Each structure stands twice: as C-alpha cells, then as structure tokens.
Amino acid sequence: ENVSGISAYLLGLIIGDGGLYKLKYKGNRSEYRVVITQKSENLIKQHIAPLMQFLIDELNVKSKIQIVKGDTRYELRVSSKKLYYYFANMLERIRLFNMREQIAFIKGLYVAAGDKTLKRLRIWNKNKALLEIVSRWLNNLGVRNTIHLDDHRHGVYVLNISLRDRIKFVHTILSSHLNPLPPEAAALEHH
DNA sequence: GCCTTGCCGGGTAAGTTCCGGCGCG
DNA sequence: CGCGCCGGAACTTACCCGGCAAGGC
Ligand SMILES: [Cl-]
Ligand SMILES: [Cl-]
Ligand SMILES: [Mn+2]
Ligand SMILES: [Mn+2]
Incomplete structure (x- = not known):
C-alpha cells in the first residue's frame, strides 16, 4: 500500500x-x-x-x-x-x-535521527524500546546491529549498524523503491 | 595495515507547550 | 459554552558529528 x-x-x-x-x-x-x-x-x-x-x-x-x-x-x-x-x-x-512499513519507518527514522555521513551507520534515540524494535526488524532483514548507551549524560542510546552489512542496509533498506527514497539515497541512485 | 565500533567531548538542531485569535454546533 | 483549527514563537534540551583507541583479523 x-x-x-x-x-x-x-x-x-x-x-x-x-x-x-x-x-x-x-x-x-x-x-x-x-x-x-x-x-x-x-x-x-x-x-x-x-x-x-x-x-x-x-x-x-x-x-x-x-x-x-x-x-x-x-x-x-x-x-x-x-x-x-x-x-x-x-x-x-x-x-x-509489515515489511514495507518497517522499511519506510526505518528510512524515516534514519533521515531524522541517523548518521547522515553514511561513513558510519547509526541512529540515536532516547527511547531504547523503540531502537530495540528496529533492531529486531533489522536482524530479520539480515542487517546486524547493536544497541548501546552512547551518551550517559543525557541518556541517549545509539543503534549501530554493522558496516559488514553496509551494502545490504543502504541498498536494500535506504534505497528500496517500495516507498519514498530518503534524499541522500535518491542522490546515490541517480549518481 | 587497516577496518570496525564503543566511548566520549564538541557546537548545536531539534522538540514542547505556551499565547491570542477564529470557527462552529 | 465547549471544542477544534490557525499563526506565531519562546523556552528547553541540544544536534548528530567526528576523533581516539582497543580489538581482531
Ligand atoms: Cl539518510
Ligand atoms: Cl475547528
Ligand atoms: Mn534530525
Ligand atoms: Mn531533542
């Protein structure tokens, strides 16, 4: 849909x-x-x-x-x-x-709260439960990842996506044509 | 040799809830 | 009178960014 x-x-x-x-x-x-x-x-x-x-x-x-x-x-x-x-x-x-919605949500969460350099693949959020849900989805999609407390000061957690699966994450998730492409993903595809 | 990633400090991009106004049954 | 859109913005907590070094292959 x-x-x-x-x-x-x-x-x-x-x-x-x-x-x-x-x-x-x-x-x-x-x-x-x-x-x-x-x-x-x-x-x-x-x-x-x-x-x-x-x-x-x-x-x-x-x-x-x-x-x-x-x-x-x-x-x-x-x-x-x-x-x-x-x-x-x-x-x-x-x-x-469902899978489509998961991918759309992750794209959106990434544009908003992700590492935009794409040199590293990270999402910051204070809601660990939320990042844990995304972690599970990513695992089901074959993208390995970990969640750690990145900032003890303010209690913000980070979801780090293993660079071993960078291609899979970027191409399969950020670049899916099943829904709107994030700006930086659209740029890569058009070169 | 170099990639990866936990960890942490840097200079700030988001978030949150006020305010005065209007519209409508 | 009781609620729900509009337009603005002050106020609060930063924003992701990027360096470092330990680990591991
Ligand atoms: Cl992005
Ligand atoms: Cl209304
Ligand atoms: Mn953002
Ligand atoms: Mn914030």
Whole structure:
C-alpha cells in the first residue's frame, strides 16, 4: 500500500525529529498537532511537505499544512484531531508493521535521527524500546546491529549498524523503491 | 595495515507547550 | 459554552558529528 508506506515514512520523521501533541488551552479549548521539525527549509518544503499533503488528501483531512519558521529550525505542522489519532494509533501498533512499513519507518527514522555521513551507520534515540524494535526488524532483514548507551549524560542510546552489512542496509533498506527514497539515497541512485 | 565500533567531548538542531485569535454546533 | 483549527514563537534540551583507541583479523 502506497498510503501505509508514506505513513510509516512520516511516522519515522515524526518520531525522529517531531512529535504528536494533544494540547489543552484556556476556555476548554484544545488542539491536536502532527509535527516534524528540521533545520533545512528545503527538506521540509521540497521533500516532507508534499508527502504529508498527499496523506492529508488521501485521508480526507481538512486541515492545512503549516510551515512555521523558528529561530533554530522550521516546523511542519498539521493541526488535526483526525491526523493526530491516525499517527498515534499507528505508533501504538508499530510492532505489527509489515515489511514495507518497517522499511519506510526505518528510512524515516534514519533521515531524522541517523548518521547522515553514511561513513558510519547509526541512529540515536532516547527511547531504547523503540531502537530495540528496529533492531529486531533489522536482524530479520539480515542487517546486524547493536544497541548501546552512547551518551550517559543525557541518556541517549545509539543503534549501530554493522558496516559488514553496509551494502545490504543502504541498498536494500535506504534505497528500496517500495516507498519514498530518503534524499541522500535518491542522490546515490541517480549518481 | 587497516577496518570496525564503543566511548566520549564538541557546537548545536531539534522538540514542547505556551499565547491570542477564529470557527462552529 | 465547549471544542477544534490557525499563526506565531519562546523556552528547553541540544544536534548528530567526528576523533581516539582497543580489538581482531
Ligand atoms: Cl539518510
Ligand atoms: Cl475547528
Ligand atoms: Mn534530525
Ligand atoms: Mn531533542
């Protein structure tokens, strides 16, 4: 499914560089936000926003995509109870992702929280349970990896992908045409 | 000879929840 | 009155990045 793949990709970005927020305001007012932030304006507008917009249209979500410029980064934001729960329930059921969704999610998580040099293959996150799920998926895909506490200070774990399986990881996972290619993977393929 | 990877410090790119406003039953 | 989109941004915790050296083949 094209929509489930894009969805899993976006969830990867949300988990890695954004979030899902249920806000309560003065006067019993409220808001539900789907958020992805990124320093690069181009990435948010040229790569991420069009995918989100496709999803919004497919799901008949009436809300608009907002791009807010902040001091340190751009924010892509959709204010939508419907889209919020769509992603929050998907995240709840993450262990049940099929292979396609797994790969889309890993791509997204990597763009957001991965080692972009690709000299080493690493993903940082404070959620060990999350990295452990990804570890299992990678193993099933034949990509060896380890999880260690990379930063004792702030308690951020790292998922290190064995360079023995660099080709398999990059070609089979980052470069799968089953769903949107991460920018650096698209570049490699077009050379 | 060199690759790999745990480990750790460097200079910062994300995240999180406020605010005032509007719309609508 | 009770909720849910919009637009902005202040505030908080950094961001992944990259060097080093131990191990192992
Ligand atoms: Cl990438
Ligand atoms: Cl509304
Ligand atoms: Mn990021
Ligand atoms: Mn953070």
